[PDB]
Amino acid sequence: VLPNPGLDARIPSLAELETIEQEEASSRPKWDNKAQYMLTCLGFCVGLGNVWRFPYLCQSHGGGAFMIPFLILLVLEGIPLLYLEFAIGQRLRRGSLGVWSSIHPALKGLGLASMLTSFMVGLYYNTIISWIMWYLFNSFQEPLPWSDCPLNENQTGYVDECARSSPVDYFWYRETLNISTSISDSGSIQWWMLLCLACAWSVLYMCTIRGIETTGKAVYITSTLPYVVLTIFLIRGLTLKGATNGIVFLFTPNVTELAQPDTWLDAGAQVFFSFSLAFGGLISFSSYNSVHNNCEKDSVIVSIINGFTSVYVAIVVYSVIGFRATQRYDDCFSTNILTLINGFDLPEGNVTQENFVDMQQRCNASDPAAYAQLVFQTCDINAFLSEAVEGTGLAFIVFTEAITKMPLSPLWSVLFFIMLFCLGLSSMFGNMEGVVVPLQDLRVIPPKWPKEVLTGLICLGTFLIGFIFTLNSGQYWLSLLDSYAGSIPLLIIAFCEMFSVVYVYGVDRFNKDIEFMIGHKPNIFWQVTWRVVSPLLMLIIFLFFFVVEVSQELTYSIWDPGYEEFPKSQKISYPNWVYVVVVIVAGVPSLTIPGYAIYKLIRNH
């Protein structure tokens, strides 16, 4: 522990705290009640990452062998980290940039990296909401637009790439995205996805026009919608035909997969993404409470709703994957029934699923020549329960195909999509606080303009930057970017926050601050994880990133409706200028911490 020369006379001094809180009734905002603070915090951490990144990662990492690492890493990094953020913001009375600059003026890179990773994550995260709004506008009609193929110029048959693929794939790839065959060629601005973008940003600027006290009632109405629509969706999913078969696929572990490095990196980067750690929004939200506030009750209540939800969503998601894998298996197996009774002319009430293997041997013993030209499809479950459930391929290709087979199918589309919208809007409330607040402590705007001018300003900029995701190649830009700026940037900052509190500030000084606020010292469970355990697990997951960055090939999926063996996946390699993009998106952030440190130490010299 460095003695940190001049730590006092920079922070409040543990008896000024009762005095400074009675004079901040007009400078800094407040919460209305305790329930407005809890619904803002657990609405920032849920949604769009329980549906999009979790089941996409869960199939690859052992089918259902992703729930072990996840849970353990959660309870071992998640808890400790989330608890360290609620307590360092409540005492230091500042945002994200004001906390880490009062714990040595060299660690100002953590406030500038938490601002740059909140701008780049929320750049593409508000594009997924504009795709959700496009699917909500396309409801309110009983023949749903993704339920049938269009016809040719000559009205005789369907379009050639709607006949080979699904009609749900000819609404996402060709009628929504209008996707191209590579990332190296981009088309035009695609005006109908521009309007939606505008819509999204406009709706985001209406609720956060003044920071807190507008985000309040919003959080109210949006922390209920999401929670009650999921429950209405649970008793529908378990009543389906093929359910309780994708649930068993979620819970049969593949224990060989638990000994790979890449299944602990994706589990470790999901905890720092599900919990909104290393963003700086949960420090600014906890900096508005009173000093005598139990910040330990709040950190273990929010964490057991965040852990319970990520399993509660995953058994709703996998109850409709098992329903598509029974609709497809009963249609592939009905193909083998109908192709046998048409080549040998049998009645229909004799060949069924109980004796298909009995009677196909009877057909080659009767006519060995007429049986040779027949074809028999080879299909069985665990081949339909393991498919391409890639990014933006579950809410748009898996759910929207299953909704069109329920009765009252326009009703289950609206509900579902509004639910997704809510889940994704309430997480952009706190993500706007990670950009507005440290840009307001930097003194770059003249401090007589209102708060509603800076906010609007930011919005415009981000909307004008969101034009790169509306091109023809705009889905290939969102994947790459997504993954990279969502994996690297989290881990580094998360580790810098745990180190600088217990080894630069001081964990023994920090225990005097907890005893003043909540009434007692932290337990022995909080002492081992802060000093020994969790700094280490993080320091580890950080070496697993370079083990799997090397010894892998950068590939991405390509649609290409001229490629032979069309509807299966085709993976080609990235161009050589993608390292410049990757570099920027996952460098700027990290090079920022050491960057500023160096800068200041130099100013020293």
Partner: peptide, 30 residues
């Protein structure tokens, strides 16, 4: 007419008038 342009026109209409209430309230409030 494309039912998606009507629902967009109602939703973008109730948003763009909701910002000119929340801007004039702020002013007629400070």
């Amino acid at each position: 007419v494309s039912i998606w342009l009507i629902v967009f026109g109602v939703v973008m209409g109730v948003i763009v008038v909701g910002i000119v209430i929340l801007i004039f309230t702020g002013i007629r409030d400070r």
